[PDB]
Every structure is written in structure tokens, then in C-alpha cells.
């Protein structure tokens, strides 16, 4: 069994448990009574000062409640693993179909370093503080923890070897409680291989991981930056155009607005139609060109956090951008929709956060830190109510209405 | 003896508290050896040989002016040096969270902390010395054998041991509800009066078989059940008017007992503001610290004291019915709400004050109220109440669909109880045809703070105005204000201030800033207002013109 520790000179996680509905508290009590019986977790005393939040979620589709521990704080306090840690397959994104499987269940089979158990403490809250908190700590590889897939690496390899050798061409990436299986087979056989990979795990050693979260990376589209094309512009159109090209000149140094502004010479009514000059037309053409080739120099850097900004665009539409350095976007997309008049802004945003974090895992092998267009107190209240992933990314809250909303269409 | 001692560790790298004993009077010592001799007999403490190396200061003082001397130990260095524990949810159970049970009984377990053993290996850090009178003999050295009072670990360790003791009586009676809060043990049930008393007899013996004297009663009054400050009646609970101390010089150890009270009362009583009295008091420790409050604290204690002067009544929770929450708009950043199941039978009534910030508007405040109520309800009842709110469904729709941020309210219905919350002004999405276009700009000189604010328009109209003691950010809002002033009912307004755009694109309807307000009002008077934005110094006409006019 493996020796783990916290980064040098820092103490463990002491986060507070947020309130849970009655429904959720009940499910957690069931799940934990079982787990205590199976020897996975053990009640602890008050001499253990640490704590990690814990709530419950239903997955994409199940009858069933899944205990989700928010280890975010323990994760960034857990010594990175190198003495091990996983490699990301750049080919995964290029595949026609990628299915995600919950193998997390398998982590419970490996014992956790006796001395590291205390740092995994958590508490099930009681309604109206009738009873004081029921407290546990893990004795095994806890799901949602990063030190988990790291220690179950050798074990996970040995289990997939036969499938790898025989099935050599699929790509299999392991992230947290997740296993990303990608292939260029047709959905029929692709899903046969999966079920085949499924059986492999059931045979090689909560409980459901029956389900496939199937994605199609080969069909994910980036949104470029475009400029309107009109037969008659107004002072206002031109003013907007110039404001945006001036913004796009921070990313593409070759942008020129000279000949366009020159069209706004004097002081006109915003609704006045201004004819386009040859000079202007050309400048518009040339800029239009430049805006279609990629940014000059943006390769991904693994030792740096990823950053994702989201812009509520209205009518259920959302745009986002991932980057490490400002104006050096690795990706930009537009999350059009759930299909309609989606009446829960907060739900849409929570769905967008997960999709984006998914795409991010597939492409760089890690989750981005989010800058969310919401009031912290509104997000903290309702987000766990729409969460369906087994992982949780880092986020902050944007209080100041950005101007880039006006430009990322 | 029957209880399993909890393992306790001093903080890492820290050693035991070596302290010096303060000499005492023959009258304070004699007593002590008395209070001690008895304590040593119950086995609460032991005499240590000459040889332990740690020490804690021992003091001895009065309990009533009906004079006697009780014992006081200064566990200050030791509380610094002792491992952190988990205060768990230092949450406070709300009477309205209790459900109607028939029979109830409150057992006041307090004397029990002395009755819990202390980790054998840790007892040596609790050594204290009783000074000798003429220092002709060696002092007398005791160490603690039970959770010592005044220490870090007695609170949590005991409240924990208790749980373990009760957790077996609790499992055996799936129907009986038991809640523990400090001294207090609440036992509820639907049983007849006489089967209840019976079980209570088993619980009492079960606690005794684990080695802790239950007190039963020495002055026996009625069914008005007293459980951690609440008066529990068959079908209603009551909190008697809280009497706050009235005094000349406030102390740091009476001001601390105050915030605790205020907090406790904070969730029973509405509008209990305690944020000023906490900023005078924290992390500063006293041999010699004694405090005047600040005249914003004698006036608050004034307001709190006025609110705690009226009794609080409420009904219990009936899980078979919906939970309802109704809010009304009260003013000056104030809102009132009542949570109930049956109309006029309130479970909890409260008040929400606006959260600090320069600009704001009624809609953002209501939303903040809902999420506060929502979270409070989930803590007490485990569910989210339905909301009766003073805002049209059409208003809210217009708001969240257009607001640049993500926002949501739970299931809710409109209730017409003026003053209704609404949107005072609405910026347009497109330019307004036939309206005058006001390109505006401003500038200021940081050295002299002298600046100008102007605007030019497609109709030739123009105006610049000199200003003193102003800023760049100030002058662009000032320029907008001027534009709003001199324009008709409908108006297009081009600016180059990202700052001004930020403030207006937030749609505020009161700011604690006179200027913004002036603009706000001006907006409320307009029928149509289209507010554009352009980059500065890029040659767009009429941004340049006006820039030239205000720059120099
Ligand atoms: C070019 C810089 C100094 C600048 C920034 C912001 C403004 O609002 C201005 O009006 C301006 O004239 C200049
Ligand atoms: Mn300006
Ligand atoms: Mn200017």
C-alpha cells in the first residue's frame, strides 16, 4: 500500500458543510450505513479537526442517489503524484465517438494510507440540527479524490491490458472517477466494445456504472470572430464594427480601423445611412481575412491553470472562451441550447459548466477554473441541484458586466 | 470510568504550558485546598508528585454576594497549545423546526462534563499549583482526570461522548426523538403521558449505567417546557422577552456573552444587527482590556434592546403541509418575510437588510432575500418554501431574460401587497430613429482636480461645463447627466466610458452616490434611452469633437 502526504507545510482541509435538503440527507444516511458495513468508511471522533463538504446527486439517468464528496480543497493540498500520475492522449479529441464510464466504484477496493485517512473526514448534516453531525473518514481510495486514480493506476493498467492488446486502436483516458473510451468504430460495434469493456471490469473484480455518456468530439465546433455583411450601414453599425475590430486588434495586430472611422467624420444621427467608400470596403475586406486564420502562437501549457469565461447571450444561448493568457484563446464556442425557452438560467449555466469542463478534460486532460456570470449566493444555493458529473471544477464570480458580451457572438 | 477516553494531542511541535503561579491570600488558599480536597475525592483531580513540569494558573473567587469561594483555572496557554477540534455545526435548532409530538420532557444534563474522563496521556498538561501560604512548604499540585472546565476540549469531547451514550437508546426507540443542545436534552414522543414517563425512567437508568449522574428535579414547576431558552407548549412555542444587561462599563467577557445571546436571538427576532459590536471584539485577550462602545454601539444596543423587548410566538412544523414564505418591501434596504403553512399561523418571521454596495435595485434585493430565506428553510425544515412575492410575473420575466447575469427564483406566485417591486427604466436594444444623438465625453486634471463635462449633437446643440474637485470617472457620468438633462423624451447617447456603461448596464435604481442617483431619476423621466459605446481616441466623429472640447 502507498504512502501519501500533503504538500509540505500546510494543514489539511477544513471546509464547512453546506445545508442539504431532507431528501438528500436520507439518501446519504442509507449510502453511508451500507459503506460502513462494507468497511469502506468509519465513524470518527471530535479529535479529528478536518472536514470536506458532501452532497448527493442523481446521474444522467438513474433511480439512484450517488454520494459526491467535494474534495476540491483536499485535492489542491494533496502532494502531486510523482515518485504516479497519468498521461493524456492527444488523439482522444480526434476520435469519432468517445464514451465515458464510471469506474470510480473500483477505487474502493484499495486501502488508504492509515495516516492519511483523517484528512478525508466528512459529516452528514441533520435537519434543524436536531442531532449533531454523523462523522466519517475513509479507509479506502475515495471517489472524487485525485490521489485515487493515481494509486489505482497500476491496477487499472493490468485490468485493461487484454482489451488493449486485442482492441489496440481505441484510446482509453482515465480522469478521476472517469474512464474516457474513444474509437473510430461505428456506434454499433463501438458500443459492443464498450459493453465488452464493461463485462471486462465486472469480471476482473455506488453500483452503477451501467450507463454510457457518449460524446462526439470530431464534431465539436469552434466559433470564429466574424464581421457583419450588409448592403447599407448606419452610423451605429459602423460604430459597433469599429469598437469590435479595435478589440480584435488586441488578438490580431494586423487589424486596421483607419478607413472605417474616417466614415464617421462629423457628428451624425446614429440612424443615418452612410455609404461605404472603396478605402473603407477594402479595409473591411482585409480585416475580415485576418479574423479567420488562428491566433499567432497559442500552444497549450500543462503547468498552468486553464481559464474559462462564460457570457450569457440571451434566449438560452451562451458563449465561452478558454485560455491561459489573455487574448490567447485555446478555444471559443457558443453553447446554443437545451432546446428552447429554458426557464432556469442557473440550470443552463450549470449544464454549460459541465459540458465545458468535459471538453476541457478530453482536450488537455484537466479542468479549467471558471469565471461565472452569477451572484455567488445564487450559485452556491442551487448548483448542486443540477450537477450530474462526478467531479467539481474551481470557479469565481464575475460581478462586473463585461463589454466582450457585445463581441463574442 | 465506564466511558472510553478520547485521545488528545497538543498542537504539533508545541510543548505543555509552563506558567507561573500568582501568590494568594491565606483566605483564598484555605478554601481552595477545601474545594480541591472534595474534588480529589470524586476523583475529578489528583495530587501529582513533585516531578511534573507543566503548570496552569489557579485563581479563586465568589459565587453570590452570599459569599463562598469557587475554583477558577486560567486555561489560556493550554487552550492555545491544544489540538483543534470539530465544533460541528455550531448551528442553533429553531423551535419551529420541532414537530408536534404529544409527550415531551427536558432533561438538563450539565453536571456531566465533570463526569467524563480525560485522556490519560493528556492529563499531565492540566497540572496546576495551589500556592503555599508563607511559601514554607511546597505548593500542592493537582492534575485533572475529567474534562476540565475552561479548556478547549471539554465542550466537544463531552457533547460527543453523550451522542455515543444516547445513540443506543436512540436506535432502540425509532419513534422517540432526542435532541441535545448544551445542558439541555429534549425527549419527544407520541406516547400517553404515562408510557412516556416510563421510557424516561429507562433513559435515566441507561445514562446512569454509563457513569454520569443525571440530575432529575429539585424545584418542580410545570409543562411549560424549557428547552435551551424556548417555552414549549402543546401546540405553540414562545421565547420570552430577552433582558439585556444595563451597565456603565462594558467588558470583553460580557460583550462576548452578548453577541452569543444576540446571535441566539438573531434567528428568533427580526432585524437584530450585531456587526458593529463584533468589530470592537475579537482576538484581543485580557488581563487589562476594558471597553467603551462607540455611539454607534450604544444606539444599536438601543435598537436591539427595543426588539428583544417583545415576546416571540410561533407554531410547530407539520410535514404534511406546504411551506409558504411571503415577503414585503419595507424600505431603506429592508424587507420583511413570514414563513407559514396555514395562513396567519407563522412558523418564523424575519427581516432582511440589503447587502453593502454602491449601487443596487429592488429586484436584486428581493432575489437576495429569497436565497437567504431558501437557505434558512433548508436548514430548519430540510425543504424550500413556496414564495408569495410582491412582483408581477411579467416584471420578473423582463428582468432575468435581459439581465447580463444568470438569475433564478424558486416556485413563486405574485401577491399584490404594495409597495410592489418593479423596473423604473429600460434601456433600448437598438438606436432610436428620430431621436437626437448625444455624443458625450469628459476629462479632468488629477493635479488640480479641475475638469469639464460636455456633449455635442447631430442637431448642432452643444455644451461644456467646467467642474472643480472632480475625477475622470466622475466627469463621464457628469457628461451623461448633462445629456439626459438637455434632451427630449427619447434620446440616443454615445459614450466612451466603460465605467459609466458598467454602472448603467447594471440597471441600478438607487445609489448612495448623489450623481448616479441624479442620472437614475433623469432616466426614470425618459420614455426611450439608447446608450451606445465607442473606443476613445480612434477618430469616430462627435466622440472626437466633444473630446477636443473637454480636453483643452
Ligand atoms: C487615451 C487615454 C488617455 C484615454 C482614456 C479614457 C477616456 O475616457 C478618454 O476620454 C480619453 O480621452 C483618453
Ligand atoms: Mn472618455
Ligand atoms: Mn476623451
Curated annotation (Swiss-Prot), chain B:
Outcome of mutating residue 185 to R: 20% loss of DNA-directed DNA polymerase activity. 21% loss of RNA-directed DNA polymerase activity
Binding residues for Mg(2+) 2: 441, 476, 496, 547
Consequence of substituting residue 154 to T: Complete loss of polymerase activity. No loss of RNase H activity
Source species taxonomy: Viruses, Riboviria, Pararnavirae, Artverviricota, Revtraviricetes
Name of the protein: Reverse transcriptase/ribonuclease H
Outcome of swapping residue 165 to D: 16% loss of DNA-directed DNA polymerase activity. 24% loss of RNA-directed DNA polymerase activity
Mutagenesis / variant outcome for changing residue 227 to A: Complete loss of RNA-dependent DNA polymerase activity. No effect on RNA 5'-end and 3'-end cleavages
Biological source species: Human immunodeficiency virus type 1 group M subtype B (isolate BH10) (HIV-1)
Effect of residue 170 to R: In strain: Isolate PV22
Residue intervals of the Reverse transcriptase domain: 42-232
Amino acid at each position: 500500500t502507498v504512502p501519501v502526504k500533503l504538500k509540505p507545510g500546510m494543514d489539511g482541509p477544513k471546509v464547512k458543510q453546506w445545508p442539504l435538503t431532507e431528501e438528500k440527507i436520507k439518501a446519504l444516511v442509507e449510502i453511508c450505513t451500507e459503506m460502513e458495513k462494507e468497511g469502506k468508511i468509519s465513524k470518527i471522533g471530535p479529535e479529528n479537526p478536518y472536514n470536506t463538504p458532501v452532497f448527493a446527486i442523481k446521474k444522467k439517468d438513474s433511480t439512484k442517489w450517488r454520494k459526491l464528496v467535494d474534495f476540491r480543497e483536499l485535492n489542491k493540498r494533496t502532494q502531486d503524484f510523482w515518485e504516479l500520475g497519468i498521461p493524456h492522449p492527444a488523439g482522444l479529441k480526434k476520435k469519432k465517438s468517445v464514451t465515458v464510464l464510471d469506474v470510480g466504484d473500483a477505487y474502493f477496493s484499495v486501502p488508504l494510507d492509515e495516516d492519511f485517512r483523517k484528512y478525508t473526514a466528512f459529516t452528514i448534516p441533520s435537519i434543524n440540527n436536531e442531532t449533531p453531525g454523523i462523522r466519517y473518514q475513509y479507509n479506502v481510495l475515495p471517489q472524487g479524490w485525485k490521489g485515487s486514480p493515481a494509486i489505482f493506476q497500476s491496477s487499472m493498467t493490468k485490468i485493461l491490458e487484454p482489451f488493449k492488446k486485442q482492441n489496440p486502436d481505441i484510446v482509453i483516458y482515465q480522469y478521476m472517477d472517469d474512464l474516457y473510451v474513444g474509437s473510430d468504430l461505428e456506434i454499433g460495434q463501438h458500443r459492443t466494445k464498450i459493453e465488452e469493456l464493461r463485462q471486462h471490469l465486472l469480471r476482473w473484480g455506488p453500483p452503477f456504472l451501467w450507463m454510457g455518456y457518449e460524446l462526439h468530439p470530431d464534431k465539436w465546433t469552434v466559433q470564429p470572430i466574424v464581421l457583419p455583411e450588409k448592403d447599407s450601414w448606419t452610423v451605429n453599425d459602423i460604430q459597433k464594427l469599429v469598437g469590435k475590430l479595435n478589440w480584435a486588434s488586441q488578438i490580431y495586430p494586423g487589424i486596421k480601423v483607419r478607413q472605417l472611422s474616417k466614415l464617421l467624420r462629423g457628428t451624425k444621427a446614429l440612424t443615418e445611412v452612410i455609404p461605404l467608400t472603396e478605402e473603407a470596403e477594402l479595409e473591411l475586406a482585409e480585416n475580415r481575412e485576418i479574423l479567420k486564420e488562428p491566433v499567432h502562437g497559442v500552444y497549450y501549457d500543462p503547468s498552468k491553470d486553464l481559464i474559462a469565461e462564460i457570457q450569457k447571450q440571451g434566449q438560452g444561448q451562451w458563449t465561452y472562451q478558454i485560455y491561459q493568457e489573455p487574448f490567447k484563446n485555446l478555444k471559443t464556442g457558443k453553447y446554443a441550447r437545451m432546446r428552447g425557452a429554458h426557464t432556469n438560467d442557473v440550470k443552463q449555466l450549470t449544464e454549460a459548466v459541465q459540458k465545458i469542463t468535459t471538453e476541457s478534460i478530453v482536450i488537455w486532460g484537466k479542468t479549467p477554473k471558471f469565471k461565472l456570470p452569477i451572484q455567488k449566493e445564487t450559485w452556491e444555493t442551487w448548483w448542486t441541484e443540477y450537477w450530474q458529473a462526478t467531479w467539481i471544477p474551481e470557479w469565481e464570480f464575475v460581478n462586473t458586466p463585461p463589454l466582450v458580451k457585445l463581441w463574442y457572438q | 470510568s465506564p466511558i472510553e477516553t478520547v485521545p488528545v494531542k497538543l498542537k504539533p511541535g508545541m510543548d505543555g504550558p509552563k506558567v507561573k503561579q500568582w501568590p494568594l491570600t491565606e483566605e483564598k488558599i484555605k478554601a481552595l485546598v477545601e474545594i480541591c480536597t472534595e474534588m480529589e475525592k470524586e476523583g475529578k483531580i489528583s495530587k501529582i508528585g513533585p516531578e511534573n513540569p507543566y503548570n496552569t494558573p489557579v485563581f479563586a473567587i465568589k459565587k453570590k454576594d452570599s459569599t463562598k469561594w469557587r475554583k477558577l483555572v486560567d486555561f489560556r496557554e493550554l487552550n492555545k497549545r491544544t489540538q483543534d477540534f470539530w465544533e460541528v455545526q455550531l448551528g442553533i435548532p429553531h423551535p419551529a423546526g420541532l414537530k408536534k409530538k404529544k409527550s415531551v420532557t427536558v432533561l438538563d444534563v450539565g453536571d456531566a462534563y465533570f463526569s467524563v474522563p480525560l485522556d490519560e496521556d493528556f492529563r499531565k498538561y492540566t497540572a496546576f499549583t495551589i500556592p503555599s501560604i508563607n511559601n514554607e512548604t511546597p505548593g500542592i499540585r493537582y492534575q485533572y482526570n475529567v474534562l476540565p472546565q475552561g479548556w478547549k476540549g471539554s465542550p466537544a469531547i463531552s457533547q460527543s461522548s453523550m451522542t455515543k451514550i444516547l445513540e443506543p437508546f436512540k436506535k432502540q426507540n425509532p419513534d422517540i426523538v432526542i435532541y441535545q443542545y448544551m445542558d439541555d436534552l429534549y425527549v419527544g414522543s407520541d406516547l400517553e403521558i404515562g408510557q412516556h414517563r416510563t421510557k424516561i425512567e429507562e433513559l435515566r437508568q441507561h445514562l446512569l449505567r454509563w457513569g454520569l449522574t443525571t440530575p432529575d428535579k429539585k424545584h418542580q414547576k410545570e409543562p411549560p417546557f424549557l428547552w435551551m431558552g424556548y417555552e414549549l407548549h402543546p401546540d405553540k412555542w414562545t421565547v420570552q422577552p430577552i433582558v439585556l444587561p444595563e451597565k456603565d462599563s462594558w467588558t470583553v467577557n460580557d460583550i462576548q456573552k452578548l453577541v452569543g445571546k444576540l446571535n441566539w436571538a438573531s434567528q428568533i427576532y427580526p432585524g437584530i444587527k450585531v456587526r458593529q459590536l463584533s468589530k470592537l471584539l475579537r482576538g484581543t485577550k485580557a488581563l487589562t482590556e476594558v471597553i467603551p462602545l462607540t455611539e454607534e454601539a450604544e444606539l444599536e444596543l438601543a435598537e436591539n434592546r427595543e426588539i428583544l423587548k417583545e415576546p416571540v410566538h410561533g407554531v410547530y412544523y407539520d410535514p404534511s403541509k406546504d411551506l409558504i414564505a411571503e415577503i414585503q418591501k419595507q424600505g431603506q434596504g429592508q424587507w420583511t418575510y413570514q414563513i407559514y403553512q396555514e395562513p396567519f399561523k407563522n412558523l418564523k418571521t424575519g427581516k432582511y437588510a440589503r447587502m453593502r454596495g454602491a449601487h443596487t435595485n429592488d429586484v436584486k434585493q428581493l432575489t437576495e432575500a429569497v436565497q437567504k430565506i431558501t437557505t434558512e428553510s433548508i436548514v430548519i425544515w430540510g425543504k424550500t418554501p413556496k414564495f408569495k412575492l410582491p412582483i408581477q410575473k411579467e416584471t420578473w420575466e423582463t428582468w432575468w431574460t435581459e439581465y447580463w447575469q444568470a438569475t433564478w427564483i424558486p416556485e413563486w406566485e405574485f401577491v399584490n401587497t404594495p409597495p410592489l417591486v418593479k423596473l423604473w427604466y429600460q434601456l433600448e436594444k437598438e438606436p432610436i430613429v428620430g431621436a437626437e444623438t448625444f455624443y458625450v465625453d469628459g476629462a479632468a486634471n488629477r493635479e488640480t482636480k479641475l475638469g469639464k463635462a460636455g456633449y455635442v449633437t447631430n442637431k448642432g446643440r452643444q455644451k461644456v461645463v467646467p467642474l472643480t474637485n472632480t475625477t475622470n470617472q466622475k466627469t463621464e457620468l457628469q457628461a451623461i447627466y448633462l445629456a439626459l438633462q438637455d434632451s427630449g423624451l427619447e434620446v440616443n447617447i454615445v459614450t466612451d466610458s466603460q465605467y459609466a456603461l458598467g454602472i448603467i448596464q447594471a440597471q441600478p435604481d438607487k445609489s448612495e452616490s448623489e450623481l448616479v442617483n441624479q442620472i437614475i431619476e433623469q432616466l426614470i423621466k425618459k420614455e426611450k434611452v439608447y446608450l451606445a459605446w465607442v473606443p476613445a481616441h480612434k477618430g469616430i466623429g462627435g466622440n472626437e469633437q466633444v473630446d477636443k472640447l473637454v480636453s483643452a
